[PDB]
Amino acid sequence: QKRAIYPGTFDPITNGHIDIVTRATQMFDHVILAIAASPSKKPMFTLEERVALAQQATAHLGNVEVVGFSDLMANFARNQHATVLIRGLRAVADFEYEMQLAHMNRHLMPELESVFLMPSKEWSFISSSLVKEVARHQGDVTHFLPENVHQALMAKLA
Amino acid sequence: QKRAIYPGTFDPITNGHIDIVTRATQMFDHVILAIAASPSKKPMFTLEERVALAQQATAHLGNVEVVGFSDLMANFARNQHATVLIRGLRAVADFEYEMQLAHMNRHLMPELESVFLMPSKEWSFISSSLVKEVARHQGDVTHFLPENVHQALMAKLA
Amino acid sequence: MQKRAIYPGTFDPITNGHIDIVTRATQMFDHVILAIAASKPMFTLEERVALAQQATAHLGNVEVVGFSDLMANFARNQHATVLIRGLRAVADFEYEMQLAHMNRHLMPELESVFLMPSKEWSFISSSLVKEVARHQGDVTHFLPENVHQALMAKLAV
Amino acid sequence: MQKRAIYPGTFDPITNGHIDIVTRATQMFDHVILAIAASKPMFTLEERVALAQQATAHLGNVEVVGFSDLMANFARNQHATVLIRGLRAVADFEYEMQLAHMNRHLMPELESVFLMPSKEWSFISSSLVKEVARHQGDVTHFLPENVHQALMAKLAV
Amino acid sequence: QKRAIYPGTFDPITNGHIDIVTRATQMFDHVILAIAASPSKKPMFTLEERVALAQQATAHLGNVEVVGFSDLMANFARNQHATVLIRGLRAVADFEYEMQLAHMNRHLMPELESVFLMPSKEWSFISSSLVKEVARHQGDVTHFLPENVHQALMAKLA
Amino acid sequence: MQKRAIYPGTFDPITNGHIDIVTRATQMFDHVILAIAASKPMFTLEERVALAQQATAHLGNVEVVGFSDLMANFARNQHATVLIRGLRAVADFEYEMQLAHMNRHLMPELESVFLMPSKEWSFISSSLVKEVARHQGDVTHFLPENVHQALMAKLAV
Numbered sequence: 038q039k040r041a042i043y044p045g046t047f048d049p050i051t052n053g054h055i056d057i058v059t060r061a062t063q064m065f066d067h068v069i070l071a072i073a074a075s076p077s078k079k080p081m082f083t084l085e086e087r088v089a090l091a092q093q094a095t096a097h098l099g100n101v102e103v104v105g106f107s108d109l110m111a112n113f114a115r116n117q118h119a120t121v122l123i124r125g126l127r128a129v130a131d132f133e134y135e136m137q138l139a140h141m142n143r144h145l146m147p148e149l150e151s152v153f154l155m156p157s158k159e160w161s162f163i164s165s166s167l168v169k170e171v172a173r174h175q176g177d178v179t180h181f182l183p184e185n186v187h188q189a190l191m192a193k194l195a
Numbered sequence: 196q197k198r199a200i201y202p203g204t205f206d207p208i209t210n211g212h213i214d215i216v217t218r219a220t221q222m223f224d225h226v227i228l229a230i231a232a233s234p235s236k237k238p239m240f241t242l243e244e245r246v247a248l249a250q251q252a253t254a255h256l257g258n259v260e261v262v263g264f265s266d267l268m269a270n271f272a273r274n275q276h277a278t279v280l281i282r283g284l285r286a287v288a289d290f291e292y293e294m295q296l297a298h299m300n301r302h303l304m305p306e307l308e309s310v311f312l313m314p315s316k317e318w319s320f321i322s323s324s325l326v327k328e329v330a331r332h333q334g335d336v337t338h339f340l341p342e343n344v345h346q347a348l349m350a351k352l353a
Numbered sequence: 354m355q356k357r358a359i360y361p362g363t364f365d366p367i368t369n370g371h372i373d374i375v376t377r378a379t380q381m382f383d384h385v386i387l388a389i390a391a392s393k394p395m396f397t398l399e400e401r402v403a404l405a406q407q408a409t410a411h412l413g414n415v416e417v418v419g420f421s422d423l424m425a426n427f428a429r430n431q432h433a434t435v436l437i438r439g440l441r442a443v444a445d446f447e448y449e450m451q452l453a454h455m456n457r458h459l460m461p462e463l464e465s466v467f468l469m470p471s472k473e474w475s476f477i478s479s480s481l482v483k484e485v486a487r488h489q490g491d492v493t494h495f496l497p498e499n500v501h502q503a504l505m506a507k508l509a510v
Numbered sequence: 511m512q513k514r515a516i517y518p519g520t521f522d523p524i525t526n527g528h529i530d531i532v533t534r535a536t537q538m539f540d541h542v543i544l545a546i547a548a549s550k551p552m553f554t555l556e557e558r559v560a561l562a563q564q565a566t567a568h569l570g571n572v573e574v575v576g577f578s579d580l581m582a583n584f585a586r587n588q589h590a591t592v593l594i595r596g597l598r599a600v601a602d603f604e605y606e607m608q609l610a611h612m613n614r615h616l617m618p619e620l621e622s623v624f625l626m627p628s629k630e631w632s633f634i635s636s637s638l639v640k641e642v643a644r645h646q647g648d649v650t651h652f653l654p655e656n657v658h659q660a661l662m663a664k665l666a667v
Numbered sequence: 668q669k670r671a672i673y674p675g676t677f678d679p680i681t682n683g684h685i686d687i688v689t690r691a692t693q694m695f696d697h698v699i700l701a702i703a704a705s706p707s708k709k710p711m712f713t714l715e716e717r718v719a720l721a722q723q724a725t726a727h728l729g730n731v732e733v734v735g736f737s738d739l740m741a742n743f744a745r746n747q748h749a750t751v752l753i754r755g756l757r758a759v760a761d762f763e764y765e766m767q768l769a770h771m772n773r774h775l776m777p778e779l780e781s782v783f784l785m786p787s788k789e790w791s792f793i794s795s796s797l798v799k800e801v802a803r804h805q806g807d808v809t810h811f812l813p814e815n816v817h818q819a820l821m822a823k824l825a
Numbered sequence: 826m827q828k829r830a831i832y833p834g835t836f837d838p839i840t841n842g843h844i845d846i847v848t849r850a851t852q853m854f855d856h857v858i859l860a861i862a863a864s865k866p867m868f869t870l871e872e873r874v875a876l877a878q879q880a881t882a883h884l885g886n887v888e889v890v891g892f893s894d895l896m897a898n899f900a901r902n903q904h905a906t907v908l909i910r911g912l913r914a915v916a917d918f919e920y921e922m923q924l925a926h927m928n929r930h931l932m933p934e935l936e937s938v939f940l941m942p943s944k945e946w947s948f949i950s951s952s953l954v955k956e957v958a959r960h961q962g963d964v965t966h967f968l969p970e971n972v973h974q975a976l977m978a979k980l981a982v
């Protein structure tokens with residue numbers, strides 16, 4: 038049983054995130070989608086909201102477990118008995134900061150291997166931040182979000 | 196009549212912005228310099244201030260129209276009957292975020308073509324943020340701003 | 354208000370990415386010159402011109418021409434005031450900025466405009482397509498039908 | 511749950527950076543094929559395979575094989591569903607993203623996975639090592655002992 | 668007597684900073700480690716705290732002088748009679764912003780030459796921000812900080 | 826307190842960007858060696874040295890020398906403790922970081938220092954200048970007078 042963790046702020050989870058976690062489940066026996074509380078980022082949705090949205094959005098994937106956490110990433114991964122940490126790679130600025138995080142996590146937990154997946158071309162130019170920005174100005178983001186997430190984002194901004 | 200829109204926060208408009216809008220007017224019949232309210236960015240100048248500064252700074256360009264807006268970019272462009280969106284390209288981090296915005300705008304308004312211009316070497320290393328930072332510490336920024344803007348920035352910080 | 358734009362490249366061979374860019378250019382400017390450089394291409398200049406002409410024949414305001422001068426020199430003699438460049442990724446951007454500053458030095462009245470291809474074509478180039486096809490990979494999706502036929506014939510011999 | 515992964519490259523010659531990557535891969539996947547491309551290398555394909563075999567003999571689930579097809583074609587015929595790529599810096603990232611989208615077009619069932627080397631090996635490549643050694647620089651730290659011996663012999667003649 | 672200035676926010680000073688300033692002292696007769704007040708960055712440590720930490724962390728380097736400042740960088744460098752400004756280069760996003768700052772400083776003080784040093788591989792993936800983030804979640808950062816700084820960071824977060 | 830710095834490159838030919846960098850170096854360090862690598866240049870090593878000498882003769886503390894060893898080996902034998910590199914754009918930065926870590930491995934006592942050229946020269950290189958000039962573009966602004974004369978003569982034949 039190979040266990041992988043897919044951590045992030047997921048504020049909110051997008052179709053880009055869904056693509057990454059789906060490809061993770063095709064590679065590893067069990068995938069933990071781990072939502073960081075991230076108070077420093079002032080998330081639009083609470084951790085409880087983000088967990089519920091991701092749970093509904095991944096219910097069709099049998100080997101996904103959605104969990105919220107505030108611990109240090111490396112500690113949470115060890116405590117989940119994960120040996121693989123999944124991250125999606127979008128742009129150069131993401132890549133460089135991801136290298137930093139990966140080298141720090143390797144110092145904290147050497148047996149946790151960071152692996153990067155590339156999203157579909159369809160999602161390679163979207164982010165949670167960009168979708169929220171469009172929605173803040175009432176633009177149509179139905180294409181970029183799971184149905185349940187779109188409703189919740191519309192409701193939140195209403 | 197080809198109509199182009201040059202959107203941005205313009206907080207405040209710099210000589211780099213003046214260079215871009217000038218080259219836009221040499222290419223398209225009518226250029227709308229569109230100032231986004233951008234409350235999330237906490238602009239130093241109000242939208243009304245930024246519009247007045249840009250109006251004075253572009254008065255010598257006959258086919259520039261300065262307008263403020265809070266709508267979604269794509270909607271404002273459609274409502275202005277613009278089919279070209281101008282953006283200046285400065286650095287790598289700008290380029291990647293501009294690609295995101297352009298692909299999102301293309302989803303929202305497919306007939307709005309995003310085109311990028313390269314500023315003069317003189318302005319390729321300045322930004323509104325950098326000029327404000329120098330001025331906050333009382334450094335001489337006369338070279339980087341239109342006369343009216345420099346006065347207003349000096350007055351604002353006084 | 355009648356702008357002449359030039360879209361230069363080697364187009365060895367022209368891809369759907371090039372077709373995307375030139376199509377966007379024709380919706381923006383009155384006349385677009387698709388300019389094919391004479392200089393070790395897989396296809397000859399005459400082949401590259403003929404392929405590009407057939408692939409753009411449906412665009413009424415495209416003119417396909419070959420050139421061997423410095424691009425700026427040809428643009429000047431063609432009375433172009435707009436230079437079309439497609440931007441795919443960071444790597445192009447950095448090299449295109451260099452070329453844009455050189456071209457502005459050589460011909461100040463030629464404005465470089467950077468267009469963005471569809472996500473569908475943002476990761477391809479003529480060189481990658483040729484390499485994949487040379488090594489028995491499927492590139493049908495990335496090329497006009499006429500180019501695909503010509504590429505298969507070229508690789509068969 | 512028994513994943514077959516392929517780690518392709520020219521490995522001319524295999525470095526400690528490659529050893530780092532393939533070692534990480536073997537801790538993640540059941541079987542890893544270290545696939546050496548036939549195509550102007552300093553070492554012949556037979557030399558490169560023998561060097562890589564000796565340098566990975568301690569890894570029980572590594573299989574070193576040569577191939578001359580398109581990488582995706584070989585991966586398909588090997589029933590690999592995971593493609594291992596090492597990421598050193600921004601420059602690789604940009605080119606690897608291109609290749610990853612092409613490989614997904616060619617073989618959708620092959621997932622590209624990017625691994626990160628130790629800081630120790632993040633700035634080296636086979637080409638840089640060869641260039642330094644060719645010009646009388648010390649590269650002992652960057653190579654397996656067997657490769658170091660073979661490189662010295664090659665440069666002596 | 669060649670005088671160099673190594674400016675930054677140093678919130679807090681890391682082993683990466685120590686590496687850079689050490690290599691600066693091997694190249695120039697006198698190095699001023701200059702700590703910017705940086706109120707816009709909301710530093711975790713006060714300027715007085717950051718100065719004291721850096722002073723203790725560099726006490727073994729005889730030709731380092733630690734000073735705090737709120738002036739414009741170029742003015743402070745001129746007033747220190749420095750003709751070399753040291754900056755460490757970590758990642759692409761740093762590099763581009765450093766080019767901006769260097770070209771602005773060259774406009775403000777042409778005789779102040781900006782020079783960039785590359786940190787050891789050991790520190791090329793750490794930053795003050797990343798260390799603080801790990802420590803906020805109680806992760807072990809002993810490896811990345813001078814002893815006195817680690818204690819102060821532990822105490823601050825306690 | 827008497828630092829010896831080396832500024833290595835191919836300088837084929839030396840440009841105003843190189844002159845900018847070496848001038849900045851001489852204002853920082855006591856002695857600067859402009860080191861020209863022997864290795865398919867447009868100008869011979871003897872031409873490149875003579876061109877660089879004339880273009881820097883006004884700088885009293887510059888020494889122009891040719892070398893064929895590994896750059897680090899030559900720097901060691903010259904008792905240089907400072908390595909001068911010019912940084913133009915992101916692309917250089919990424920490759921220079923690689924080289925800097927290799928050079929630190931080869932000669933730990935050689936510190937790499939990166940200088941920034943004027944905005945005027947931030948987009949040029951010897952290769953771009955040669956390519957533009959080869960294709961009948963004006964490069965007078967980017968070169969010392971003596972180099973411009975020599976480049977015209979070289980391209981005439």
Ligand SMILES: COc1ccc2[nH]c(C)cc2c1
Binds near residue numbers: 111
């Ligand atoms: C739970 O939230 C976080 C947020 C940022 C984080 N960075 C690292 C290294 C661990 C971590 C955990």
Ligand SMILES: COc1ccc2[nH]c(C)cc2c1
Binds near residue numbers: 232299
């Ligand atoms: C008027 O202000 C804005 C600010 C950011 C924006 N992003 C997009 C896609 C549209 C928009 C409008």
Ligand SMILES: COc1ccc2[nH]c(C)cc2c1
Binds near residue numbers: 425438
């Ligand atoms: C960016 O400007 C240029 C300069 C020279 C060029 N040659 C070709 C074939 C395309 C091109 C574009």
Ligand SMILES: COc1ccc2[nH]c(C)cc2c1
Binds near residue numbers: 518520547595610
């Ligand atoms: C990223 O995918 C590829 C494609 C072709 C390839 N050839 C070799 C030798 C390695 C490789 C990797």
Ligand SMILES: COc1ccc2[nH]c(C)cc2c1
Binds near residue numbers: 705
């Ligand atoms: C003392 O603090 C600062 C902070 C940012 C700064 N930028 C520039 C150009 C000078 C300066 C000084």
Ligand SMILES: COc1ccc2[nH]c(C)cc2c1
Binds near residue numbers: 833834897910
């Ligand atoms: C960055 O370090 C190096 C290494 C080898 C080098 N060769 C030449 C001609 C310049 C140079 C610089």
